Design a protein around this ligand. Structure first.
Ligand SMILES: [Mg+2]
Ligand SMILES: [Mg+2]
Ligand SMILES: [Mg+2]
Ligand SMILES: [Mg+2]
Ligand SMILES: [Mg+2]
Ligand SMILES: [Mg+2]
Ligand SMILES: [Mg+2]
Ligand SMILES: [Mg+2]
Ligand SMILES: [Mg+2]
Ligand SMILES: [Mg+2]
Ligand SMILES: [Mg+2]
Ligand SMILES: [Mg+2]
Ligand SMILES: [Mg+2]
Ligand SMILES: [Mg+2]
Ligand SMILES: [Mg+2]
Ligand SMILES: [Mg+2]
Ligand SMILES: [Mg+2]
Ligand SMILES: [Mg+2]
Ligand SMILES: [Mg+2]
Ligand SMILES: [Mg+2]
Ligand SMILES: [Mg+2]
Ligand SMILES: [Mg+2]
Ligand SMILES: [Mg+2]
Ligand SMILES: [Mg+2]
Ligand SMILES: [Mg+2]
Ligand SMILES: [Mg+2]
Ligand SMILES: [Mg+2]
Ligand SMILES: [Mg+2]
Ligand SMILES: [Mg+2]
Ligand SMILES: [Mg+2]
Ligand SMILES: [Mg+2]
Ligand SMILES: [Mg+2]
Ligand SMILES: [Mg+2]
Ligand SMILES: [Mg+2]
Ligand SMILES: [Mg+2]
Ligand SMILES: [Mg+2]
Ligand SMILES: [Mg+2]
Ligand SMILES: [Mg+2]
Ligand SMILES: [Mg+2]
Ligand SMILES: [Mg+2]
Ligand SMILES: [Mg+2]
Ligand SMILES: [Mg+2]
Ligand SMILES: [Mg+2]
Ligand SMILES: [Mg+2]
Ligand SMILES: [Mg+2]
Ligand SMILES: [Mg+2]
Lengths: 121, 51, 48, 129
RNA sequence: CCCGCAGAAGAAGCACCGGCUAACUCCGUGCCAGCAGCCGCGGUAAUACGGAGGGUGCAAGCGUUAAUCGGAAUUACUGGGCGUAAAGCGCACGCAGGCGGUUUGUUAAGUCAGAUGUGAAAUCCCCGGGCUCAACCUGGGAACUGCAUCUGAUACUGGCAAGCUUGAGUCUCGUAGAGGGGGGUAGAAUUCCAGGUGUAGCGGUGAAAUGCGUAGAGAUCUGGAGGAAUACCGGUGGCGAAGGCGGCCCCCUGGACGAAGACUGACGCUCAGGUGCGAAAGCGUGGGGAGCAAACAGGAUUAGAUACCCUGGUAGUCCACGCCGUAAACGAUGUCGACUUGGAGGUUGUGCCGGCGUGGCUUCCGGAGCUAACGCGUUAAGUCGACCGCCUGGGGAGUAC
RNA sequence: AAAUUCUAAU
């Protein structure tokens, strides 16, 4: 562009939006589980992933992923969620913090304990 | 090509439902299909209902 | 049903067997009896 | 239209040197004469001469050392669409001093190190190196 | 802060080991359970899932999540692009705006030099000092790239005054052309109407059938009516800003080019808004209707054929006026100016003695150079200058409001 | 001169 053309109309910068909008620039949020179920991933993976539908404290209604082997969650349980996207799951955009308010750590987990909230034996 | 997209039949006897009530669900097969140009193994499934 | 290995497995009771050729010939009485057994001990256990 | 005679002179010199011509001839002007004098004293051309009275013509003689042009790059800087003026303490250096830059200061058209010696700034004409 | 006392006596965890990225084997499960920042692992012989042994990296911390800059030259002022990857408005006129051939005088507005005042302290950087070192505290300096005023310089840009002819424009003679608007007229051919001769087929297709014909078709001959388009010339030939322009004659009219001579004296280039032109289809009113032919009907082909083929056929194609404003509106290449080896042609002027030069426009090949390549290559996509238009991953979408 | 199609793991 000509320097005159730039003086008349300067350069713009990409907005570069966020991909975890339900958190609202918060590291973690608290919510209530309205539904706990399972779902099937995209091509080519195949499993029965465990997800949950959660209503936050600011009114948002999102879907969260429950990692680890086995959970004690059910309807009407309060949990703490954080960012993180599961790729092959379409619509899942957050992760459930294990070891939080009403979710317990993975039973018999001796490696990477702090990521699943298990106390040192 | 081959069998039935859906078959519905009636089985009549003494003691039928008490032994066929556990076949209701999904049945998975892993094998080389007949409609296969190459030699690939394929996984497929069928659904069974007993009432 | 795995034809490459010739193995039939039942996930409800976790029972694997290597007699698929007999099973595909209407000899599945060797598959349904183990289930019924496990289906009956629960019925007695579900009396509370 | 012709809105830059100095850039035309620079382009004429560049196209003459790239094509292995023996000289370049163009219409004359005082500023072109000053730039040609600076170039001749700095050793980038052999000689220059002006002839005629009503429509003066300036011609420069190009020089080649090993069968290749002495002047490698020459580029106009302060073009009509955007002018560049610099202070004495921030006069540019070309090729870490191996090349030269032509600046018009209040004492005339001269090089950059000469203006540093004089302690003067001005408008930068071109980078030749 | 110092001295003494007893005892190694009270004090190490977190993440990772497929590549990016430093660090590997065994067992368990068998696209299940599960892992994942991006590629991607797991289907009964997994260095990628879970456990164990081993190793790697940080360490009173280690990992994960949220937010910012960097890498990202991925908004490119430093420092990007538009022939084919995203990207030149369909074309032109033109106000505001941006830019300005050459000489002299004057001004010092921009520009440059010096001086002065100001730019709080802390912070940042440098040379030192004090806490046993460090973090920390602190002395002095440097810096705060800025602003204003005074005095100087006149090379470049601007203002004022006077000029100059090379950019631009006017006048005299002539040339070529499907350039535009209006009117008149000529020939060939199709269709229709009337009449003569004449008798059993005509038409069409790969083959058929629909259709026409003994109520005399097709064929051939004579007379008439009306509409539309201009065979040969005709040619990567000519003209026009683009769209576009083709029989012959007349009337009004725009531009281009050439040879000489005279005249004005920078009057120029580009151009957001704005304005005008703009193929075909389509719309309104009033005419016209030969041929062709969307929609429609029938006959064939086919598994079906709302198509390709055959027989018919209405809007439309034509004229006057008024709208519409879109095209693969393409050279997928904005306008203007300067510079840089060659060859073979075409078309249109002029000078000199069939030959020797000099202008305008145009087609093909190709050198240097440029490009990712294909290719462009004096009519540049090579080297530069001025101004305008446009682009920032693929869909959603040139879509909704 | 006729002539449609080939899902999903190497
Ligand atoms: Mg390694
Ligand atoms: Mg891991
Ligand atoms: Mg194994
Ligand atoms: Mg593992
Ligand atoms: Mg492992
Ligand atoms: Mg940047
Ligand atoms: Mg980033
Ligand atoms: Mg730039
Ligand atoms: Mg780019
Ligand atoms: Mg394309
Ligand atoms: Mg494109
Ligand atoms: Mg164009
Ligand atoms: Mg114009
Ligand atoms: Mg001006
Ligand atoms: Mg001044
Ligand atoms: Mg100053
Ligand atoms: Mg300070
Ligand atoms: Mg002046
Ligand atoms: Mg002036
Ligand atoms: Mg004409
Ligand atoms: Mg004409
Ligand atoms: Mg007749
Ligand atoms: Mg032309
Ligand atoms: Mg044009
Ligand atoms: Mg004329
Ligand atoms: Mg005069
Ligand atoms: Mg406009
Ligand atoms: Mg029309
Ligand atoms: Mg009409
Ligand atoms: Mg009408
Ligand atoms: Mg008709
Ligand atoms: Mg039909
Ligand atoms: Mg017809
Ligand atoms: Mg008719
Ligand atoms: Mg009209
Ligand atoms: Mg368009
Ligand atoms: Mg066209
Ligand atoms: Mg285009
Ligand atoms: Mg040009
Ligand atoms: Mg070429
Ligand atoms: Mg160019
Ligand atoms: Mg290119
Ligand atoms: Mg996008
Ligand atoms: Mg629209
Ligand atoms: Mg089908
Ligand atoms: Mg296929």
């Amino acid at each position: 562009a000509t320097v005159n053309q730039l003086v008349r109309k300067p350069r713009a910068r990409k907005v570069a939006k966020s991909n975890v909008p339900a958190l609202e620039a918060c590291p973690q949020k608290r919510g209530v589980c309205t539904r706990v179920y399972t779902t099937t991933p995209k091509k080519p993976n195949s499993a029965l992933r465990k997800v949950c539908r959660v209503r936050l404290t600011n009114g948002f209604e999102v879907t969260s992923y429950i990692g680890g082997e086995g959970h004690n969650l059910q309807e009407h349980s309060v949990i703490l969620i954080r960012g993180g996207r599961v790729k092959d799951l379409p619509g899942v955009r957050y992760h459930t913090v294990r070891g939080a308010l009403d979710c317990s750590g993975v039973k018999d987990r001796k490696q990477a304990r702090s990521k699943y909230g298990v106390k040192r034996p | 090509h081959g069998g039935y997209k859906e078959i519905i039949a009636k089985i009549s006897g003494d003691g039928v439902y008490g032994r066929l009530k556990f076949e209701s669900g999904g049945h998975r097969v892993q094998r080389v299909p007949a409609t296969e140009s190459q030699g690939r193994i394929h996984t497929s499934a069928c659904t069974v209902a007993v009432m | 049903y795995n034809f490459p290995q010739g193995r039939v497995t039942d996930h409800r009771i976790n029972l694997t067997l290597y007699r698929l050729d007999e099973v595909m010939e209407g000899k599945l009485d060797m598959l349904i009896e183990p289930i019924i057994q496990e289906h009956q001990a629960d019925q007695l256990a579900a009396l509370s | 239209s012709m809105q830059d005679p100095i850039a035309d002179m620079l382009t004429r010199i560049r196209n003459g040197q790239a094509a292995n011509k023996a000289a370049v001839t163009m219409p004359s002007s005082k500023l072109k004469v000053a730039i040609a004098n600076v170039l001749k004293e700095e050793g980038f051309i052999e000689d220059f001469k002006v002839e005629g009275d009503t429509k003066p013509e300036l011609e420069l003689t190009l020089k080649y050392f090993q069968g290749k042009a002495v002047v490698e790059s020459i580029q106009r800087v302060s073009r009509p669409g955007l002018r560049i003026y610099k202070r004495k303490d921030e006069l540019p250096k070309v090729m870490a001093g191996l090349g030269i830059a032509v600046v018009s200061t209040s004492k005339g058209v001269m090089t950059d190190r000469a203006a540093r010696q004089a302690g003067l700034g001005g408008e930068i004409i071109c980078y030749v190196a």
